[PDB]
Amino acid sequence: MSREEVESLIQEVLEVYPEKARKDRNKHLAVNDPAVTQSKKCIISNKKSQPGLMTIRGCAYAGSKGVVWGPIKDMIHISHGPVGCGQYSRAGRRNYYIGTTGVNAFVTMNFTSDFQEKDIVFGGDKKLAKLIDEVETLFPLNKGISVQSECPIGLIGDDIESVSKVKGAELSKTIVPVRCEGFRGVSQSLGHHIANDAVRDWVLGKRDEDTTFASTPYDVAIIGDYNIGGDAWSSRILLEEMGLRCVAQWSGDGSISEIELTPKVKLNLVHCYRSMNYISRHMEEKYGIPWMEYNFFGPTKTIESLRAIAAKFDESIQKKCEEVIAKYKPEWEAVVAKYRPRLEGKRVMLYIGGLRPRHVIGAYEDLGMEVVGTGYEFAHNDDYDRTMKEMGDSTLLYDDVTGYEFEEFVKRIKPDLIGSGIKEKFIFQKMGIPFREMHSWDYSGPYHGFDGFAIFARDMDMTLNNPCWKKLQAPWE
Amino acid sequence: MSREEVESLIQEVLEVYPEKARKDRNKHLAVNDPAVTQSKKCIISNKKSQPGLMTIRGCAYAGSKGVVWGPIKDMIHISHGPVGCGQYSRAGRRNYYIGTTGVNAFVTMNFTSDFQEKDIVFGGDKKLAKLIDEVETLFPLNKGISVQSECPIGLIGDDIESVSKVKGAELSKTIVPVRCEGFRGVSQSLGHHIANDAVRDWVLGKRDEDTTFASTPYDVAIIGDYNIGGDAWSSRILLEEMGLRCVAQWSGDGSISEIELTPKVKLNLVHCYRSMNYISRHMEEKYGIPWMEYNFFGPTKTIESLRAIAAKFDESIQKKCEEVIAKYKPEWEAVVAKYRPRLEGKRVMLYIGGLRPRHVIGAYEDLGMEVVGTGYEFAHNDDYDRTMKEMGDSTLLYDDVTGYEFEEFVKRIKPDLIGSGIKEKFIFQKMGIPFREMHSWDYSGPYHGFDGFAIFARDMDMTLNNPCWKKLQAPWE
Amino acid sequence: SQQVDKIKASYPLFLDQDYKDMLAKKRDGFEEKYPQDKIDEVFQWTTTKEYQELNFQREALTVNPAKACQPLGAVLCALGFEKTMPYVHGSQGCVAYFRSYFNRHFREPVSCVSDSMTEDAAVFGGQQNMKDGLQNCKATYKPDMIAVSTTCMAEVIGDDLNAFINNSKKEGFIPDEFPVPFAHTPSFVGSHVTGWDNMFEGIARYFTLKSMDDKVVGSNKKINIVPGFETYLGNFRVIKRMLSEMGVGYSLLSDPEEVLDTPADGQFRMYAGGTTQEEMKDAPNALNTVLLQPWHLEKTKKFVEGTWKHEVPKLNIPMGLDWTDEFLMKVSEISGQPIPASLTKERGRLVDMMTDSHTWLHGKRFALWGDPDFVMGLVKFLLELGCEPVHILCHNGNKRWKKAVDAILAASPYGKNATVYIGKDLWHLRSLVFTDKPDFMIGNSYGKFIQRDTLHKGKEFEVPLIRIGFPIFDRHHLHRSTTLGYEGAMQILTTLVNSILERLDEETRGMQATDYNHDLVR
Amino acid sequence: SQQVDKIKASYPLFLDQDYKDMLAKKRDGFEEKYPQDKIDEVFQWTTTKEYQELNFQREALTVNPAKACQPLGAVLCALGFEKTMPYVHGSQGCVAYFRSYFNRHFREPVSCVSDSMTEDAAVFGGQQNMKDGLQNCKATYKPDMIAVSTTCMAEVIGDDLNAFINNSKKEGFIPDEFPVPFAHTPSFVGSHVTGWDNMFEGIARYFTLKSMDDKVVGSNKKINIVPGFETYLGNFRVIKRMLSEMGVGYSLLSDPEEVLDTPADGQFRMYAGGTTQEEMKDAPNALNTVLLQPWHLEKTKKFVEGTWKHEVPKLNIPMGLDWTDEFLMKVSEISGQPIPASLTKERGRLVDMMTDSHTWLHGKRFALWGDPDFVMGLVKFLLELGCEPVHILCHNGNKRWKKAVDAILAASPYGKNATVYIGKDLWHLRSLVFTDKPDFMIGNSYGKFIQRDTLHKGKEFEVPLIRIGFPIFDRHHLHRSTTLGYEGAMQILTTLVNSILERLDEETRGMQATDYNHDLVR
């Protein structure tokens, strides 16, 4: 497929739409040019979804409760509003943790205010106050509470901030009101922002006057790793083998204390830029902590990341860096030797949220695969700016892709593998295209770091080369 | 039904048979008269089965391997001949034992010489010799070997006695040849006899002049308890609470050493008369050990038995006897109080092997049930002699009952419960008559002793009063 | 580290010593974790009768609900109609979750659109979204019908669906003849099963309310079947099979069985099968209408009686022996078809299995949960099997339903130790299975966390989960199962008896300890 | 002691302290038991490679066989014919065992007689037994046919069945036209499956050998189906279902599905359904004859080809995807009927399930055993699922079969670590799952003892049993399952992927230990 065929593909697909939608969707589809450093010349993003077109996008609540807050393991997070949102999100996301669930850790539980009509009509504020006391009674080892607003909270004019302040002062407890109602923004994205701002305003400054923390020159925090299938653990082990001290992870397997300690570190290491750049920038402004983006997907990016991180410290870390890289060389080399011959030349199309649609390209390339299309549900133009140099020339970019468009792009481009979410997976398997979940890792992982690259390789191979794909056509048809 | 009605049931049923079979089966069906002390004046038993009439009977191998020898836990029993017999009989009988199966215990395993045609044609003696060496290598903790002859062994002229003598001498090992070929006798019964004589000739004498074992005046053996679902254990505990020392159990959970020690006891307690009267008579003749029949089914028989046993000793045992009886009094009373109201007046028909068809009658009566019919597969006239006074006047007795007879009897008499074997169970369930397995205890038990009566009572109630029985009729018929 | 010949995923990778050491250091360094002794103390406390009393006094807090929200149901209902797009008026976040929830249960595509209302729609509502949404959906996905429900934002803002759809037709966004049934589906009222009821009544109203003049009850010689919220493919299939076996003319109204089980043959089929518009239009001409799950089909019932003039029979869900019998006898009566030899034999096969299996089932104690009709059918069958349904939890149940179940329990000796709970959640159920331990749980996948909690107390306190219900996410293809009819009863019986026997095998597998009872034959 | 409100059967009764103490005293007092340290030492030794080499050098001793004797198969074959009594000439002990064996697997009545030959029959032979036996059987149980097989006693003494049955007719014990097909079924040759083949060829011979001159291949427009030794009711049913869906005329020759699944309706039916005598008499007029289990139907085959002149196609057992496809295309070719839309969809639903489940199945390692056709079909399907069938054991297998399975393994990357064993028993297999541990065993109930052994070594060495095969005695109603066709494949796929997920849930159920991987969604 040439540049002209892809442009022509974009036009043919857009032909089904009514005029308003056609004009909008045209701006959200582009053929990559890696010379372009300003993505706003090439593609529009972070805009309202067109009604009725079967977007894959979620809401602010998903971005706040599902993504940023829900993983913090020693706090209780209240899905505040009707029962739906908390139930559908309950344990959907594999943000792994170590704890005693229901006792000191609460991640896979669903706490909810289960709004009824009387709550809609007369407000939920008295119910929330009562809820907080019932939580204190039945879950005494919780180290804080967050209140994750669902759609009705803001619409009915509830004042969760005042309940938070009053109940927080009464119980000497951090209670975080979060205005992540799903009607806000256009996607999960504004949920991230609101969530980061809630951390800033209600949690992060608690230890500003406390000088008891025994700091070292090598203290770092992992920012924006949600430990999907243990991803953060497989990252963290490398950073500590390189001689760093990982004081905090935000927010996979994260604790409230380690969030409160983060202002004491020397360097914030940002994996998910999209979801955590907001607090990262805050911490640099307020505490003078520098942050840097990294990438632990596949050996090339992990090596490059380890070197770049170590270069921020003294010779001794740079020396340990080289020892880590030497240690893992034979392991990732064995993975390449086994799997790259099984996957070389295979073509991949991705569609994921805010980070992975560019971040995983290097891992695919380490296995000799070619990402021929990618896109994001809710990325901003600063994400597409980082994407364009990572993707090949004349590859397809899609922002907030419709189900229709995705299906039609795939029918034409005929990738060997697709990597997307659960709403996509069954569609493409039926078309007989190998599919890997690139959110949940298909219940596998971790995929971060050197240990994760082995699993990623095994998984892409197991699916792409599976015997089931030869069988879809009955031998009599 | 009256005496006249039953006599005519017998005549109507027999009408179907040809002359020869009619005349034979007539002699094997009778209407009880409890006056009669000489059962040979009203029923024939222990005769060949009529061809083609679907007897429920097994063979002499079942009687020797399946019943007497197979339970002996620390010996390896070779099913010697083709593969069938060892396989159908493998772990079918719940002769329970404590041990490490495959290491020091072998009860639920199937060892076989798996005869092929070359063994039939040229003899199996060389194969059996090789087999014994292979056993010694792979099962070094076995404490002896029995050789259980299947049909072909005697037919083809094998000399397993010579192989047993030669290999026994070579390895200094008890190897017991058992001529329990299924063509022998007419039933399981001859198998018991052959097996008893094998114990006598090859095992029991081993320690005749060895006096290292320190006997006490309170030494007993349980003879003819195969520990079905733990029946022997439930019996044993009562005898030891009464201050006796149980030196051996034949052969449920039995070891070779406790068989060897048995001639050191003061009294042989015989539960299963039919299977082990032979060795009990031998032990009285040779060692002067008296034996007595007992019955541990239901509180009435267990109490009577404990008192009869204790009266053989001294006042100390008689005293503990009354202490045991006082202990279990509230327990069996609470069983009766709970279950007798649920079972009172219910009518039972039994068909079992050689003992339980008379032995369990008391347990039924302790729950206020009536045994209106009973019969044995392979009982002799001495069993019928013991049966006639346990059964009520004008009840039906059947020896080696045919499938046909049993069905037709049940159809006319309409018992509330049938207790028989696996070959009968599914027939009667389809006719809507509650059925309890009275060999295997339907995977329940034990039923012996006080502890067993509770389970027996729970089991009869659960089956007899089960909701499934009111549901066989479709409401539209 | 990894060995390339045996790659370890998260489990068991993080049991390697270096990961253990590192996770200890994280805990001790930075987590300010409560001491293990105190965690154990609180855990022990959460298993107590004292904690259960505090737990059952909750008024405000819900923990681990066993219900979902209205529009989930409306979507499932809509999917049962031929080339129909479920369309939820309101916030798209909702629709991502609906689709995922069903995706994970059915392991199938689930098609559903939103009209992506945002904060701006608070000023003057969602009318423009409806107009563009309907137009865009129709053009792009080419459905023959769009079935509209609502998310809570749209309900709270008070959007008038009727006017909004009328105005969309008025201004030409969709053609006047294009079918757009709708229903208000407030998530803060009832649960997902109410959504189904509302959606269905909306669709039935749409197709019949205005064309009643020409309708004659009985004239099509058929029976309408309304299945309600149903997530076992086998349930749609067995009703159809049983009715075709009797030679009963029938219309299954809402039938997603085809669209939730399309073949993987190289093409994605967005639509398949489903109740036709022609069937919904002709439905008032049926002899009568049968509601398979009456306890969430109250609104449908009032409409079908009030408007179609059908004398909807008082039938329980056809689950277990008695209620399947009653369903078949009522269908026989309404249709004039006799129950054929084939169903009589199938019934007897079920009874045969009940006699074969009764000794292991007898007295077995269950905690269970689900939707009202499913829960009462299960309760009823358990009593038929001689099991004790000790803890009966229906989060979305109501007082009248609870009375009906209390009477079923009262009418059987096996109900004597049973309590029904309504408006209680799985954190409530957790307490009940610690304080008054049953043998097993029958529930959905959320039950696994309660099994985990029981095991933590000790192996002897573990209460194994038997997965029957919705959703099941941690096993594959159970959604193909059957729970209705004799077939369903036979599947349930088999699962129950084999769950008991598996557990017994586990408990008797200990060499020279408990393996005296490790019988070959059970 | 017992508490009346909670009565304990053997487990857990014997774990009470007083029974434990009593059993300790029995052990110490009288059993002369090897010290526990020595027992542990020998146990450990039986788990080693050294022990396995010794084990595999056995020539004389068989331990824990995975086969039965010929007449067991003869009986099952006989049962498949309308109002037929299986009659085993010889020793009655055999018949008690046959019946019990099948009773326990099917939990149904199994009707079978003996002619109760005793020691006296060694002088003369069993001629009088056959005469009285046939007369008695015919009179008493009123079958329309008596199908005669032999026990090993009768084979060794050399009874001529043909002559004996002929003399029974000549002397008026039974009418000459009363059908009495027979087969010699020596237990010391082959296995149960061989008996089935011998019985079936015997019956086919009886009804066709002397009346071929009027037969015309193709004239009845049907296909004969010979199922072989089959103990899943679903398998007879799925074959008939698929052929009816295809509109193919067929005769299933030996069909016991009715008589092994009679209703519990208040009457005992000794006989039900089955292949009619007319079906067998007319079988040579079929288009062709298909053998579902060719590796134990070799004699049948020679007769069908040799006498009926049917060109029996070279088909594998229709198990899994490729072989169901081939069976159906061959049937399409012979019949001229196209494979219908319905079977196409079903096939695609199977493929859909394979795509949904493939990540959990990939690379999973299995030990498995059973009869030749079943085993190779299972091997084939496992390879199609991307599983590794590492230990393949067929006790009654032969060299030619093995070569066939080796070629199937060689044609797949998934076969690289697989070994096929013939003439080896479950004590051999025990060694293999210790020295080269798979993830699971697929086998019959006898495998439970191997799972027990593996657990004793430790939890991380436990190899769980997945029960597929014959006999299954420790689970209820699995004999209702299906293993043939797409249906069978779907049932096997579901059992496999859920067995994996059940085991993963067990391993990850450890609070604050392994429950990081206790996912709600898999």
Ligand code: ICS
């Ligand atoms: S937080 Fe974001 S959609 Fe950065 S909302 Fe989403 S666990 Fe995706 S591409 Mo699910 S911006 Fe994380 C994401 Fe990426 S939930 Fe996970 S996979 S790296």
Ligand code: ICS
């Ligand atoms: S030995 Fe006998 S047939 Fe006495 S061969 Fe049989 S375990 Fe029966 S009535 Mo099965 S003479 Fe024992 C018997 Fe009774 S196997 Fe058991 S139940 S008390």
Ligand SMILES: [Ca+2]
């Ligand atoms: Ca699917």
Ligand SMILES: [Ca+2]
């Ligand atoms: Ca049955």
Ligand SMILES: [Mg+2]
């Ligand atoms: Mg138990």
Ligand SMILES: [Mg+2]
């Ligand atoms: Mg106990």
